[PDB]
Each structure stands twice: as structure tokens, then as C-alpha cells.
Amino acid sequence: PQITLWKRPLVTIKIGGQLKEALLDTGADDTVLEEMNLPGRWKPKMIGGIGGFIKVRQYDQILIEICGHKAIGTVLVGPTPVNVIGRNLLTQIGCTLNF
Amino acid sequence: PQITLWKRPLVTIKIGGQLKEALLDTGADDTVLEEMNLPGRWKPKMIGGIGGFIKVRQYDQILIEICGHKAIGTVLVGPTPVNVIGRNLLTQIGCTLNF
Ligand SMILES: CCOP(=O)(COc1ccc(C[C@H](NC(=O)O[C@H]2CO[C@H]3OCC[C@H]32)[C@H](O)CN(C[C@@H](C)CC)S(=O)(=O)c2ccc(OC)cc2)cc1)OCC
């Protein structure tokens, strides 16, 4: 499909057997999701943006489904203000910018 | 053009007659550029990112050319980690997400 940018590019994702809303974010190197108690090991990490850095938990080889398109990669979990799907997963669903 | 996301979607912009590199950022509502000198009046404003809020200078109806495409809109200037082109200008140049 094609998504215009008049409004925030919000889509439904499936992760850890749960459905959530997330932003398709070409400005995000990595995927950052709201607090959720995913199973398995993780490693601490700090990511920075406008306003400074926050602490997140890095989970690897996590399966996410975005608009029916499956992807597997690293997901960062922490007190993020919004769920963002970053380039690490957007590439896997064949997402491009076009103008 | 069509831009893939294996690398950061960085493009050259022209603003205030000066060339700069900026990030096409579908997760940003607004356009935020690093500290620079622009002519005309400006109003102080606040914007919040992943790590909190920063103080910016809001310039309205500024001419900005993005990858050869002209736009005239609001540009925020402040301590952002990188120049980001937000949806307020991405819509003007006809940019969409596609997968
Ligand atoms: C406490 C305030 O509360 P808020 O709820 C905050 O909400 C939001 C917070 C963040 C975003 C997404 C970011 N957009 C953003 O900063 O946009 C600003 C300007 O335009 C406004 O629109 C939304 C916010 C304002 C951006 O797309 C991606 N980022 C990096 C960019 C900056 C290049 C370095 S990154 O997230 O930091 C990030 C860093 C490293 C990563 O992997 C290693 C992964 C992600 C969207 C909404 O209030 C405002 C809505």
C-alpha cells in the first residue's frame, strides 16, 4: 500500500502475541516499543533523540508483523513516549520513501 | 525518486541560500534543524522528543528546497542531534511511504 503523511503514519503491529499501534519512522535507526514484559534475555542500552537519552532493554531476533508483513530483528523496550518502527524492520517489509 | 531505508534517508537541502544535509523523518511532525542563522522574526517554542523537550526558534513560511523539491513552511531551529525534515514539509514535496 501507499501511506500519505498528512497524519502520523500509525499502523497495527503484532509482537509477542499482542497487537499494538506503532509509527512507521524513517528517522528511527532502530525500533523502540512501549514497556512490555517480553520473554527471554536482554541487554541494557541507551538511545538518544531530541531531548536526550533514555534507558531501554534490547531484545534480539524478535518477530513482528506490520500490516501483514513479517519481520525479525532487534526491538528496544523502554519508557518511550511512542512506539516507532525503525529502519531495521522497515527495510524487511520493503518500505520506501517516494516523491 | 524512490529511497530505500538500508541507510539513513539523508538528502541535501537548501535553506537561507545555504546547503545542508537532513534526514527524511516520517516520525517527526515538524522540521527541526541544528543551530543556524536565518533572517526574519522568530518566536520561541518548545518541542518534545524521545528524551524530553528542547527550546527552539520557530521560523514560519521559510523557503526550503528538499532534494530538488521546493517547500515553504515552518522550520524549527535548535539543539537537535540531526537536521530532520518532518511531515509538515514531506507532504509539500509529495512524499509517501510505500511497501
Ligand atoms: C517528552 C515529549 O513527549 P512527546 O509525546 C514525544 O513523542 C515522540 C518522540 C520521538 C518520535 C520519533 C522521532 N521524532 C521526533 O523527535 O519528532 C519531533 C519533531 O517533530 C515532532 O514530532 C514528534 C516529536 C517531535 C524521530 O522520528 C526518530 N528519532 C531520532 C531522530 C530525532 C533522528 C536522531 S528518536 O525517536 O529519538 C530515535 C533515536 C534512536 C533510535 O535507534 C537507535 C530510534 C528512534 C516521535 C514522537 O511530544 C511530542 C509529540
C-alpha cell at B47: 518541542
CB–CB of B90 and A5 under 8 A?
A: yes
DSSP category for residue B29: S
Terminal CA-CA length for chain B: 15
Distance CA A77, CA A15 (A): 12
DSSP per-residue codes, A13-82: EEETTEEEEEEE-TT-SSEEE-----SS--EEEEEEETTEEEEEEEEEEEEEEETTEEEEEEEEESS-SS
CB A23 within 8 A of CB B96: no
Strands (E), B1-99: 2-3, 10-15, 18-24, 32-33, 43-49, 52-66, 69-77, 84-85, 96-98
Domain boundaries, chain A: 1-99
Least Cα distance to B2 among A26, A64, A67, A7 occurs for A26
Helix (H) or strand (E) holding B90: helix B87-90
Asked whether B1 lines ligand 1 (CB < 6 A), one says: no
Q: How far is CA B72 from the centre of its chain?
A: 11
DSSP-derived 3-state class of residue A9: coil
Please name the member of A28, A29, A49 whose beta carbon is closest to the beta carbon of B51.
Answer: A49
Q: Is A16 on the interface with B (CB under 8 A)?
A: no
C-alpha cell at B52: 524530553
Method: X-ray
CA of B13 to the centre of ligand 1 (A): 21
